[PDB]
Structures are given as structure tokens and as C-alpha cells.
Design a protein around this ligand. Sequence first.
Ligand code: HEC
Ligand code: HEC
Ligand SMILES: [Zn+2]
Lengths: 136, 136
Amino acid sequence: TKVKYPDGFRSWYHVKSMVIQPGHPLENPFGGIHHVYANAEAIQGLRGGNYPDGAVLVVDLFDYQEDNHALVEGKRKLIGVMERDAKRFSATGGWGYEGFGEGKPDKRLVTDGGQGCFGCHAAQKESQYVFSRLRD
Amino acid sequence: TKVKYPDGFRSWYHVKSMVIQPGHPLENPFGGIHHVYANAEAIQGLRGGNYPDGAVLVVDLFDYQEDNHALVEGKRKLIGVMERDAKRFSATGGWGYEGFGEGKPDKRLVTDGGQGCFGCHAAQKESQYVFSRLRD
Ligand code: HEC
Ligand code: HEC
Ligand SMILES: [Zn+2]
């Protein structure tokens, strides 16, 4: 019932990025430059398929330094992870939710079995609980 | 003598990202959110391995919108492309330089054989004319 650390996620398909700046409703703790990654099975669901068990989405969050009108990636702050298993993660709509502080496998951030993560993703039920949209 | 359109570059390894905002000296035309991608041969050279001929780096440049203290990816502005061929592109340091407007294969931008591109990259001679560094 624990989400697996997604080893090698940095080699996956880059879905999209976004910058969350101070004042954003999600600043604490989602502030920074983030990058969304999808493994092969998550790409099937992003394309309009059903998400197969074993699909994984990662959101990779960096601090940034504002220097002379550029935002430059600093240290990794954390990753968020969604792992598809319709049966094992039935209590959170079929996705297991975990955070890893600094992207480190032993820094688990989720303390409520992912109910809080799931509560916000629940608004996205019609897209199988995923916010991010596939773009060219 | 021409740089190939890098078909499928969106599936390649994501090296890094940066945001260039108004006031930045490079705002015209490099303003926006950009993502750097590297094919297998480029990853060899970024590793502290010497770039094989056939190495390709892509810089993918999006306009962004302000959305309540978030910077959100907008329309693609252009891609910049560096293709490695020590002999064919010897006049610009072994890299061929091309731009594609809106990332469209039919909207080639470079008119001077890439001498303008090369002139800015020349300051990176000690890293084989590549600015971007590999990161975790
Ligand atoms: C709202 C109050 C949220 C809470 C609580 C959590 N997340 Fe989040 N997450 C949120 C948004 C608006 C987005 C989209 C960002 C974008 O660039 O469009 C995300 C994104 C993710 C992702 C990427 C997949 C996706 O659904 O787009 C993952 C893997 C993710 N979030 C994980 C995650 C976890 C594990 C959470 C609890 C620790 C969590 N999120 C909380 C908004 C919100
Ligand atoms: C300075 C005056 C530049 C000119 C002219 C051009 N480019 Fe550029 N480029 C520049 C910087 C500072 C960077 C690094 C951005 C970052 O995030 O660190 C880049 C990056 C690229 C890349 C990525 C590979 C790399 O060297 O890091 C490519 C493929 C690239 N640029 C292509 C390119 C082309 C085709 C140009 C002329 C049309 C060109 N660049 C001009 C700065 C400058
Ligand atoms: Zn405000």
C-alpha cells in the first residue's frame, strides 16, 4: 500500500511545465518551477485511453532564483507522484499519491494515505484525476 | 549543408528549463519559457563524453501568460536546433544552427549559415559551444 519511488522518471516523456510564484493559492508548498513527466503507460491515458495499472505521473518541483529578469532552476524541492492501481489504491480513486522531499526515496511527505492529494485531484474526475493535458 | 528538422524531439530527454522575462537583454526574441532536449548522442556529449556526429540539441520556446501568480505555457514561439557534424558544419564550430518558427518544419529562420547563432555560442567554446549543463 506504499507508492514506489519512480526510479529513472527524469528519462520519461516531459508533458508540460508551469511556474508557481509567491501569492499563488498553492505557494505552500507547490511554489517553484515544476515539470510533469509521464511513463509509457501514463501516456496512453494522456492520449485519451484508460490509464492502465502501472501508469505513473511525476511532478518535479524546483526552487528558482530571479536574476536580471531570468528565472533560473535552483535545487529540487520535492517530487509528487501518482501511481495507477485501480484495486490497491481504490480508496483514492485508483491512484496512489506520494511526495518525496528533495526527490529522495526515504523522504516520504504523505501522512494521511493520500486523502489530501486525492481531495484536490477529485475535481479532475472527468479526466481520470489528472490536471495536466498532452500538448505538442 | 542544412540542419534536419528534429522529428520526434518532444520524446527526447528534458535537460533543463529557464524563463526569460521582460527587461532581459535577450527578451527579443528569446523571451518566454524554454525547455532544452537532447537526443542519445547529445546526452553522450553533455556527459562529459565529446559529441558524436548526429548529436542534436533542441531549445523549445513558449510564450507564457500570467494567471494569478502562475506563469502558464502559451503558444510555441519557435525551436532552435543544433546538429553535430564536425566536417559539414566546420565553419560554425562543428554544429549546424537552424531555427523553426512555431516549431514548424516549413518555417526555417536562419539566413546567414548560422554565423549569428554561432557568434553568441562561441563564448562556450570550452563546453563545445553548448550552454546547457546536465542536472539531476
Ligand atoms: C490542489 C489543492 C492540489 C493538491 C492538494 C495537490 N495537488 Fe498535485 N497538482 C495540482 C495541480 C493544479 C496540478 C497541475 C499542475 C500543472 O502543471 O498543470 C497538480 C499536478 C500534479 C501531478 C502531475 C499530474 C497531474 O495531475 O497533472 C502529480 C503527480 C501531483 N500533482 C501529485 C500530487 C500529490 C502526490 C499530492 C499530495 C501530496 C498533490 N499532488 C496535491 C493541485 C494539487
Ligand atoms: C546569445 C546572444 C544567443 C544567440 C544569438 C543564440 N542563442 Fe541559443 N542559446 C543562448 C543561451 C544563453 C542558451 C542557454 C539557455 C539556457 O537555458 O541555459 C541557448 C541555448 C540554445 C540551445 C540549447 C543548447 C545549449 O547550447 O544550451 C540551442 C539548440 C540553441 N540555443 C540554438 C540557437 C540557434 C539555432 C540560434 C540562432 C538562430 C541561437 N541559439 C542564437 C543564447 C543565444
Ligand atoms: Zn495577487
